[PDB]
A paper describes a structure:
These dynamic filaments have been termed cytomotive, to distinguish them among the wider class of cytoskeletal filaments that perform organizing functions (itself a subset of all filament-forming proteins). So far, we know of only two protein families that form cytomotive filaments and have inbuilt nucleotide hydrolysis activity—the actin and tubulin superfamilies. Overall, however, the picture is clear: The tubulin superfamily, much like the actin superfamily, appears to have a shared subunit conformational switch upon polymerization.
(D and E) Cryo-EM maps of Dm tubulin prepared with GDP or GTP occupying the β-tubulin binding site as indicated. Comparison of solution-state heterodimer structures to structures of heterodimers within MTs recapitulated results seen for other eukaryotic tubulins: As a whole, the heterodimer transitions from a curved to straight conformation upon polymerization. Meanwhile, within both monomers, N- and C-terminal domains rotate relative to one another in both monomers, in each case accompanied by a downward shift of helix 7 (H7). Again, as for the actins, the hydrolysis state of bound nucleotides does not appear to correlate with position in the PC subspace —and is therefore not obviously a determinant of gross conformation.
Author numbering:
A (entry chain B): 2 to 54, 58 to 274, 284 to 428
B (entry chain A): 1 to 37, 47 to 436
C-alpha cells in the first residue's frame, strides 16, 4: 500500500523536489507538514507517499555532491523531509558512469541501502519503489542502477519503477552522454518493471517552439517534469479503480517482460474535453520526443482530471479510438483504459495525462544507439571507464542488448 | 430443515453481496442490527438474544472493500470473524490469486466456512459469488471450489459470476482469467448463473435513464435479480425448493450448467405514473433481447429447459393463459431429447426495492431461467479475445512467473473448445 521514493543525483533531486512540492500543494500539505486542505478525498490515500507521526514524505535523498543538500534544503519544501534520510557523499562522481557504479557508488551504496531498509521496514504492506534520476550523469545513472540491482536482489517480489530522463545535445551536449545513457539502459532493461522515458529533447522542443521561451532554463523543463509526475501518479494518489497499485498498472500496461518503457504526455501545456482528447494523443505534447504515429501503441492509459462530463469523456475516447484505429494493435483487445479524477492539478482547471507503451519509443533507443556508435568506433573516451574497473565487453553487451530491444520493438510494431 | 451458506469472493463478490443482503434485510424485515420484530432460516441464524446473523462469508485479498462493510450501515449485522481479509491482493492475475497469494488465506477461509457449517444441521450447499475478470474472484474462487469439493463433496456449489465487459473493465487480461477459472471450476460447480456487465449497463442507460451508470446501479439491479432467484429458497415456495432441484430442472448434463437469466420489468423511479403491467406483457418481455442479462440471440438456439418465477400480484390462471399464448411462437424451439414444457413457480410476496434507488416498485415481476445453446455465443466472444492474445503470448509471463505452468493456458482453452462443441452437438 505504501511506496518508497528514492531520488539520486542532481537531476533526480531537482525533479523530485518539484514532484513532492506539487503533490503536496495538491494534497493540501504546507511546508510545515500540516494538513491545511478542505476535502477528505485529498487524504483518503495519502499514506501511499507520506508517513503520519503531521505528514512526512517517504523520500530518500541520495547524491555524491554535498551541495545538493542545501539546494534541496533551501527549497520551499526542504524542511519537511526527514533530516536522517539525506545520504549525500563528499567526493562527487562528475559525469562518469563507472565512478558511480564501481568506485564511488559502491562506497555509499551500503549506507543508502540501510536507510532504504529502515524506511521500507516501517511499511505495513510495501507495494514497490520508485526512483527519479538521470541517464546522463555519473551519480544518478550509475549509482541508482546499482541501487536497483541491490534492491531487486533484496526485494525480488516488489515492483521497481523509475522516472529516468535521457540527455539531449541541445541541453548539455557533453561528449560522454551516450556512454552513460547506453550503460544505464542496459541495466534498466533487465532490472526494472516500469520506466517513464522522459526526454530532454521533447522538453526543450516544447519549451522553445510551443511555449516561445527563447532560452529555456532547467526550471522550465523541471516544471514539465513535475506536471508529468503528478499526472502519472494521480491514479496512485487518489482512490479509483484504474491502476490502483503499481502491480496492477504493470499488468495492465506491460505485455512483455522487456517492453516496459513508457511514453508520457500531458495537456494542456502552459479549453474543453474534445480539445483535451485531441491534444493528449498529439505528438507535440509527448515527453519522449517521438511521433506516436510512427509506430503502434501497445497499451494506452488516459487519465483526465477536473470537472468534466464523464459521458463526454467516454464518447471522445471512442471517437478517437475509431478515428485512430490504424495505430492501435489488433492483437491486444481493449488496450486503451480511461480514468477520471475530480481533483484538478495546480493552476489548471482541467487537465489530461497520457501514458503510452508504444513501439515508437524504439526511435529514442535508436538515437542513444547512434550517438553511441559515432563515439564507440574510435574509442573516444573508453579509457575513462577501464581505469575504474570496467571492461569493454560490458560496452559491447550493452550495445547488443539495446539493439536487441530495438529489434523486439520493431518486430511487435509490424506484427 | 435445510440451510444454505453464501460465499462472497473479491471486490465484485463483496459489493454484490452488500446489495443482496441489504435487500434481503428489507424483504424479510430484519433491521440493520439483526432484530426482526419459517424458511428465512435458510440464509440466517438465530442467537440467544434473537439477533439474526447471515450465513455470509466475505472474502477479499485487499481490505478496502471489506472495510467498507466493517464500518458501513450494516457493520453490526456481520460478525468480524466472518469478514476475512488479507494484506496482499492478486493484482488482476489469476496465478497470484490461485497459487501463491490465495494459498496464504485459503486455510483460514476454509476454517471459517467449516465454523459456519458446523452451526448448521441440514446444509444443502454453497452459493459462491465472484467475478471472472478479477484476480481474486477468478483464482481464489477456483482454489476454494477445488478445496470444498474434497470436504463438501455432496453439497451443491452454485455460482453467480460476473461476465466482464469493456465499458467497465479494469484490466486487459480479463479473458485470460475468465478462461482459466472456467476450466478449473467447470467440474466442481453444478449450476452457474452468469451476468454480463454490458447488459446491465445498457439496461441502466435505457430503462433507468442514467447517462453514466456506476457500480451502485449495477449492484442494485443484480441484487434484485439474485433476490428474485433465491426467493424460491427463502419463502417456502413450490419450485426450486432445494439446491438439487436447480440441477434437476436446469442442468440436464453436467457440462452445460450455464442457465440464461431474464428479469422483467425494469422501470425508472420517475416513471411510476405508468399503469401496472399485465402478466402477458411481462411474460412476453421475458423473451425480448432488451431484457437479457447476457446478450445473445436465443431465437437461434434451442431451449433445453425453462423455469419461470413470478412475484407480486399474479393470478395462476393469467399465468396459464400467458403460457398458452407463448407456446404458439415459432421462435421457441426445444431440443427433442428433452420434454417440451415450461416450469412455473408463483410467489405471492410483493417485490421489494431499495428506497432512494432508481428502480420503481412494481405490482408484479417475473424472472425467467432458460438453459439454451445460444448462450455459447457469449463463450465464443471470450475465446476470440483469448486467441488474439495467447497467439502472441501477450501477458503470459505475468502468469508463468508467479507459479503456474504455461501449458495450462492451452489446456484451459482446449477445455472451452470442447465446451463450445458441447453446445454445437446438443443444438
Ligand atoms: N456490476 C459490477 N461489476 C463489478 C463490480 N466490481 C467489480 N466488477 C467487475 O469485476 C471486474 C474485476 O474483477 P474484480 O472482482 O473486481 O477483481 P478483484 O476482486 O478486485 O480481485 P483483483 O483482480 O485481484 O483486484 C471489473 O472489470 C468489473 O467490471 C461491481 O461492484 N459491480
Ligand atoms: N530536465 C532536466 N534535466 C536535467 C536537470 N539537471 C540535469 N539534467 C540532465 O542530466 C544530465 C546531467 O546529469 P546529472 O544528474 O547532473 O549527473 P549526476 O547528478 O552526477 O547524477 C544532463 O545531460 C542534463 O540534460 C534538470 O533540472 N532538468
Ligand atoms: Mg480488488
Amino acid at each position: 500500500r505504501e511506496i518508497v521514493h528514492i531520488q539520486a543525483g542532481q537531476c533526480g533531486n531537482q525533479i523530485g523536489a518539484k514532484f513532492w512540492e506539487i503533490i503536496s500543494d495538491e494534497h493540501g500539505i504546507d511546508a510545515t507538514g500540516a494538513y491545511h486542505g478542505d476535502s477528505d478525498l485529498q487524504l483518503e490515500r495519502i499514506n501511499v507517499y507520506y508517513n503520519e507521526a503531521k505528514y512526512v514524505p517517504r523520500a530518500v535523498l541520495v547524491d555524491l555532491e554535498p551541495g545538493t543538500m542545501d539546494s534541496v534544503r533551501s527549497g520551499p519544501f526542504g524542511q519537511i523531509f526527514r533530516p536522517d534520510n539525506f545520504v549525500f557523499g563528499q567526493s562527487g562522481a562528475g559525469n562518469n558512469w563507472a565512478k558511480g557504479h564501481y568506485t564511488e557508488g559502491a562506497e555509499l551504496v551500503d549506507s543508502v541501502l540501510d536507510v532504504v531498509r529502515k524506511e521500507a521496514e516501517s511499511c505495513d504492506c510495501l507495494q514497490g519503489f520508485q526512483l527519479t534520476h538521470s541517464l546522463g550523469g555519473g551519480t544518478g545513472s550509475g549509482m541508482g542502477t546499482l541501487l536497483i540491482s541491490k534492491i531487486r536482489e533484496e526485494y525480488p517480489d516488489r515492483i521497481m519503477n523509475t522516472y529516468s530522463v535521457v540527455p539531449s545535445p541541445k541541453v548539455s551536449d557533453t561528449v560522454v552522454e551516450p556512454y552513460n545513457a547506453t550503460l544505464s539502459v542496459h541495466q534498466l532493461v533487465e532490472n526494472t518493471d516500469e520506466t517513464y522515458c522522459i526526454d530532454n529533447e521533447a522538453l526543450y522542443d516544447i519549451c522553445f517552439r510551443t511555449l516561445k521561451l527563447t532560452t529555456p532554463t532547467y526550471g522550465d523543463l523541471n516544471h514539465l517534469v513535475s506536471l508529468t509526475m503528478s499526472g502519472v501518479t494521480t491514479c496512485l494518489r487518489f482512490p479509483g479503480q484504474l491502476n490502483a497499485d503499481l502491480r496492477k498498472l504493470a499488468v495492465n500496461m506491460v505485455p512483455f517482460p522487456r517492453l516496459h518503457f513508457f511514453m508520457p504526455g500531458f495537456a494542456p501545456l502552459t479549453l474543453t474535453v474534445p480539445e483535451l482528447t485531441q491534444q493528449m494523443f498529439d505528438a507535440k505534447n509527448m515527453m519522449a520526443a517521438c511521433d506516436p504515429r510512427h509506430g503502434r501503441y501497445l497499451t494506452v492509459a488516459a487519465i483526465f482530471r477536473g470537472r468534466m462530463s464523464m459521458k463526454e469523456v467516454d464518447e471522445q475516447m471512442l471517437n478517437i479510438q475509431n478515428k485512430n484505429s490504424s495505430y492501435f494493435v489488433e492483437w491486444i483487445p481493449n488496450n486503451v483504459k480511461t480514468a477520471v479524477c475530480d481533483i484538478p492539478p495546480r493552476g489548471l482547471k482541467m487537465s489530461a495525462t497520457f501514458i503510452g507503451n508504444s513501439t515508437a519509443i524504439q526511435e529514442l533507443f535508436k538515437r542513444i544507439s547512434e550517438q553511441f556508435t559515432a563515439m564507440f568506433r574510435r574509442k573516444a573516451f573508453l579509457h575513462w571507464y577501464t581505469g575504474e574497473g570496467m571492461d569493454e565487453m560490458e560496452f559491447t553487451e550493452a550495445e547488443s542488448n539495446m539493439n536487441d530491444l530495438v529489434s523486439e520493438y520493431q518486430q511487435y510494431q509490424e506484427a | 430443515m435445510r440451510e444454505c451458506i453464501s460465499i462472497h469472493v473479491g471486490q465484485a463478490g463483496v459489493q454484490i453481496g452488500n446489495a443482496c443482503w441489504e435487500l434481503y434485510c428489507l424483504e424479510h424485515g430484519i433491521q440493520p442490527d439483526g432484530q426482526m420484530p419459517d424458511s428465512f432460516n435458510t440464509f440466517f441464524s438465530e442467537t440467544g438474544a434473537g439477533k439474526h446473523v447471515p450465513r455470509a462469508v466475505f472474502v477479499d485479498l485487499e481490505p478496502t472493500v471489506v472495510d467498507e462493510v466493517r464500518t458501513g450501515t450494516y457493520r453490526q449485522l456481520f460478525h468480524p470473524e466472518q469478514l476475512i481479509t488479507g494484506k496482499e491482493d492478486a493484482a488482476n492475475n489469476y496465478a497470484r490469486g490461485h497459487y501463491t497469494i490465495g494459498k496464504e488465506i485459503v486455510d483460514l477461509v476454509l476454517d471459517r466456512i467449516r465454523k459456519l457449517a458446523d452451526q448448521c444441521t441440514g446444509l444443502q450447499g454453497f452459493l459462491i459469488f465472484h467475478s471472472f475478470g478479477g484476480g481474486t474472484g477468478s483464482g481464489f474462487t477456483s482454489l476454494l471450489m477445488e478445496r470444498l469439493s474434497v470436504d463438501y463433496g455432496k453439497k451443491s456449489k452454485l455460482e453467480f459470476a460476473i461476465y466482464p465487459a469493456p465499458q467497465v473493465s479494469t484490466a486487459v487480461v480479463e479473458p485470460y482469467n475468465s478462461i482459466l477459472t472456467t476450466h478449473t471450476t467447470l467440474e466442481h460447480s453444478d449450476c452457474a448463473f452468469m451476468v454480463d456487465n454490458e447488459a446491465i449497463y445498457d439496461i441502466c442507460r435505457r430503462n433507468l435513464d442514467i447517462e453514466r451508470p456506476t457500480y451502485t446501479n449495477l449492484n442494485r439491479l443484480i441484487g434484485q435479480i439474485v433476490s428474485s432467484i433465491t426467493a424460491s429458497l427463502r419463502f417456502d415456495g413450490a419450485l426450486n425448493v432445494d439446491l438439487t432441484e436447480f440441477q434437476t430442472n436446469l442442468v440436464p448434463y453436467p457440462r452445460i450448467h450455464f442457465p440464461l437469466v431474464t428479469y422483467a420489468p425494469v422501470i425508472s423511479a420517475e416513471k411510476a405514473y405508468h399503469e401496472q403491467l399485465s402478466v402477458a406483457e411481462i411474460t412476453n418481455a421475458c423473451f425480448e433481447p432488451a431484457n437479457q442479462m447476457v446478450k445473445c440471440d436465443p431465437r437461434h438456439g434451442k431451449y433445453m429447459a425453462c423455469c419461470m418465477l413470478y412475484r407480486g400480484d399474479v393470478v395462476p390462471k393469467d399465468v396459464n393463459a400467458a403460457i398458452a399464448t407463448i407456446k404458439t411462437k415459432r421462435t421457441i424451439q426445444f431440443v427433442d431429447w428433452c420434454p417440451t414444457g415450461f416450469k412455473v413457480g408463483i410467489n405471492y410476496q410483493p417485490p421489494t426495492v431499495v428506497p432512494g434507488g432508481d428502480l420503481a416498485k412494481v405490482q408484479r415481476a417475473v424472472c425467467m431461467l432458460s438453459n439454451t445453446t445460444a448462450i455459447a455465443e457469449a463463450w465464443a466472444r471470450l475465446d476470440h479475445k483469448f486467441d488474439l492474445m495467447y497467439a502472441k503470448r501477450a501477458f503470459v509471463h505475468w502468469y508463468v512467473g508467479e507459479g503456474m505452468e504455461e501449458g495450462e493456458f492451452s489446456e484451459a482453452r482446449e477445455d472451452l473448445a470442447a465446451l463450445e462443441k458441447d453446445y454445437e452437438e446438443v443444438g
